[PDB]
Enzyme design. Sequence first.
Site, short mmCIF file in Angstrom:
data_model
loop_
_atom_site.label_atom_id
_atom_site.label_comp_id
_atom_site.label_asym_id
_atom_site.label_seq_id
_atom_site.Cartn_x
_atom_site.Cartn_y
_atom_site.Cartn_z
N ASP A 41 0.83 -1.20 0.00
CA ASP A 41 0.00 0.00 0.00
C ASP A 41 0.86 1.25 0.00
O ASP A 41 1.37 1.64 1.06
CB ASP A 41 -0.91 -0.02 1.23
CG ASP A 41 -1.84 1.19 1.31
OD1 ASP A 41 -1.90 1.97 0.33
OD2 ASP A 41 -2.52 1.31 2.36
N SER A 90 -0.65 15.69 -11.92
CA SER A 90 -0.91 15.31 -13.29
C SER A 90 -1.15 16.56 -14.14
O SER A 90 -1.69 17.55 -13.65
CB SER A 90 -2.12 14.37 -13.37
OG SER A 90 -2.50 14.13 -14.72
#
Length: 330
Positions: free
Chosen positions: A35, A199
Amino acid sequence: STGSATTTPIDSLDDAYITPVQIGTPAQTLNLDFDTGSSDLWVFSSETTASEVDGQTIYTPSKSTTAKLLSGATWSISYGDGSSSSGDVYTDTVSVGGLTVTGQAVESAKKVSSSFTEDSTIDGLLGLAFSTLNTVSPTQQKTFFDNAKASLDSPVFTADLGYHAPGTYNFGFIDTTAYTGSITYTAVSTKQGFWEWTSTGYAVGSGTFKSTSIDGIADTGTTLLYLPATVVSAYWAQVSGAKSSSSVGGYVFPCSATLPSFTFGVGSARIVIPGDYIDFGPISTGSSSCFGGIQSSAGIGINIFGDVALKAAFVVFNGATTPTLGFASK
């Protein structure tokens, strides 16, 4: 040193991936959920309340000649989906795909919530976010990666998650045969303890690319892709019959639909998520309403590039002095 381990989807929807991990002496092999959105290595154990164990493999530290109780140390975590667990802490030898760390904090669950008990295939979590998020008290502990870093050939690990298929976690090296083209690296903020990046935009299907900064985290421990409401609306608007359902808790769409792809920007580069990756199947057994793999982050408070996004790429988690993230197509 290096390590390399195969990671396998737990079910037919790629809800999560498990990777075998050797703990203790003699080795006890547990299948952990790696994770990159958390920083605790915690396991079902011999100390877990009996009624809260349901098919998991447990770590028994009393059977490990290298286990030592970390005196006074406790841990307690609550994840972003209501699930929780807590317990005590041992240090022991932990190996992943041939890479060994001695003195790793192994957090033994005394209590786990139903959500974890129900996942019979996941024996615990191995956190790979920054150690600043580790919940051990009163002395915070380091992640497996943090502990391994100095010894690794290169201070990196990579995630290569498969779509409906096995993939690979590598530590300490970049497998240049595992991706196409080049790896585009992008800046990371560690200020919230995550692999947090920005992004450069998105496209829906064969649509034109929209240049717009989207801050988010690279999180192997989250199944879906959580993005701003505007982006998510733009995507599902291209799917006939798709709608946001409050009763189901997200965007649903007719199972008879073929979904468009979703592209996200990494610097000047582009990662394409095929439409099929965005189909998470019937909302309930037999239903012709299907759950979407792109969902709104509104009310989460952060955008999350989870497995839907990450499995479309070869992802480098670069833990150099100034960490960065790398993405390649594959």
